[PDB]
Amino acid sequence: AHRLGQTKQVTVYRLICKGTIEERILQRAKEKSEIQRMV
Amino acid sequence: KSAIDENQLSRLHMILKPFMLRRIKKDVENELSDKIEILM
Amino acid sequence: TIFNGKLKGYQLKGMNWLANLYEQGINGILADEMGLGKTVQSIALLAHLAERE
């Protein structure tokens, strides 16, 4: 979706469930984002 | 390894740096619109 | 040798890095972002293959 040919920028809305299966995958995605930023 | 990842990542990062090309969008952000994400 | 159009300094630097890495007989990976035109850099490298080998 987001690309260099978009002058409207983008709006990213991520729907996360409340405290059931969401916290683990979200925390793992945050740690994975930290590892990707460190790489 | 895990605990040795400081020296292994220090030598492996600069050792594998010549064989890879790392580019960031911050340099191309001049003609690129701002990006943002909001979790709900 | 690119009939699509002109290339920018990032695409020219990527193609020059791929050709310079290919001149030494070694291989490498491209970690550049997906919005950098990696396909246009690959086809532009096929147009940079003019060494004829």
Cα gap A24→A1, rounded to integer Å: 26
Of A2, A14, A16, the CB nearest to B35: A2
How would you classify residue A12: left for phi > 0, otherwise alpha for psi between -120 and 50, otherwise beta? Answer: beta
Q: How far is A15 from chain B (nearest CA, A)?
A: 5
Q: For the beta carbon of residue B19, count every other beta carbon within 10 angstroms.
A: 11
CA atoms of B27 and B38, how far apart (whole Å): 24
The DSSP output letter for A34 is H
Residues in chain A: 39
SS3 B20: strand
Give the chain A residue whose CA is nearest to the CA of B38: A13
Name the resolution in angstroms. 4.8
In this structure, what token pair is assigned to residue B29? 């952000």
Give CA–CA dist C4/C2, Å, rounded.
6
For residues C32 and B21, is the Cβ–Cβ distance under 8 A? yes
DSSP per-residue string spanning A9-32? ---EEE---SSSSHHHHHHHHHHH
